A paper describes a structure:
Focal Adhesion Kinase (FAK) is a non-receptor tyrosine kinase that regulates signals involved in cell proliferation, migration and survival. FAK activation is initiated by breaking an intramolecular autoinhibitory interaction between the N-terminal FERM (4.1, ezrin, radixin, moesin homology) and kinase domains. All compounds exhibit a common 5-chloro-2-ortho-methoxyanilino-4-anilinopyrimidine core structure, which binds in a nearly identical manner to the hinge region of the FAK kinase.
In contrast, AZW592, which has a sulfamoyl group at the corresponding position, makes no significant interactions with the activation loop, but several water molecules fill the space between the compound and the activation loop. The activation loop in the AZW592 bound FAK kinase follows a non-helical path similar to the one observed in autoinhibited FAK. This allows the gatekeeper residue Met499 to rotate its sidechain towards AZW592 and it makes van der Waals contact with the chlorine atom on the pyrimidine ring. The morpholine (TAE226), methylpiperazine (TAF089), dipiperidine (TAF672) or methylaminopyrrolidine (AZW592) moieties in para position to the amine groups of the aniline rings make almost no protein contacts, consistent with their incorporation for improved pharmacokinetic properties of the respective compounds. Additionally, an analog of TAE226 that fails to induce the helical DFG conformation displays a 3-fold lower potency. We evaluated the potencies of the FAK inhibitors by determining dose-response kinase inhibition curves and deriving IC50 values. As apparent from Table 2, TAE226 and TAF089 exhibit approximately 3-fold higher potencies than AZW592.
Author numbering: 413 to 569, 584 to 686
The structure:
Amino acid sequence: RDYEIQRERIELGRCIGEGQFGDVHQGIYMSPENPAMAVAIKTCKNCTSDSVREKFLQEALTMRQFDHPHIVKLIGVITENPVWIIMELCTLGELRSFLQVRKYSLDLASLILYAYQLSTALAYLESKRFVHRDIAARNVLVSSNDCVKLGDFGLSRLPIKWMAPESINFRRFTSASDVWMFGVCMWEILMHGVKPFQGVKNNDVIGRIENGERLPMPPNCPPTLYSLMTKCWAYDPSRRPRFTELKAQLSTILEEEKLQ
Ligand SMILES: CN[C@@H]1CCN(C2C=C/C(=N\c3ncc(Cl)c(Nc4ccccc4S(=O)(=O)NC(C)C)n3)C(OC)=C2)C1
């Protein structure tokens, strides 16, 4: 059982970014016999108290519950100071950069695959009654060309243009508001890592959305798919599909794309 890893099994590599609690490094988990595996190591800033430590480690506690091919995998924790969380490394990095950089080398079928894969992770999370609250390409990682994984999972310490009307207006976050965000995430993927509502102010966004305005159909996005996206953006959350539906729809759209 035990998620506690001995610190000498970890070789800290280069800083690859920042979480809310501190720096994230790439690195290696070493074990006897045993090829050696690339890991992400999340660190914590100024946690000179239990409370900050407890908040930071909650991410690990949350990820203990999940076992999915398209969700970042927790490997372990080191709970004596400095406290670290060890995760699997998604070696190709952040989705947006990957999409931007590989625009002329990715076919439409790959973009749909990523959407389908993310929807299986989200249908999984739905069944655990886990509300993610920030589904956006910034939180998707690339493990390989044919594999993406969803991250955080962790706590703080507002993503207006990704959020459902009911999340913005009534601080409501549910499975249906996550579906809305997934729709925007799919727009980002089809758009190759372009941000929704560029040059638009956050306080403008709810005005436009309640006036019925929606993100336009991406060039070379199939109609059946933009049709699925628009259903994610139904104002009335009770009419949006659930991730179980989306997973089955994205499957047929993907398969019809690989069939020409
Ligand atoms: C932009 N500068 C960096 C240079 C290379 N970068 C990355 C980013 C992610 C990355 N892969 C990760 N794989 C797993 C995990 Cl948990 C991970 N975590 C993060 C890396 C960087 C910043 C934040 C995280 S995070 O706190 O776990 N949250 C992410 C979902 C954004 N990265 C890379 O693998 C080599 C390289 C970006």
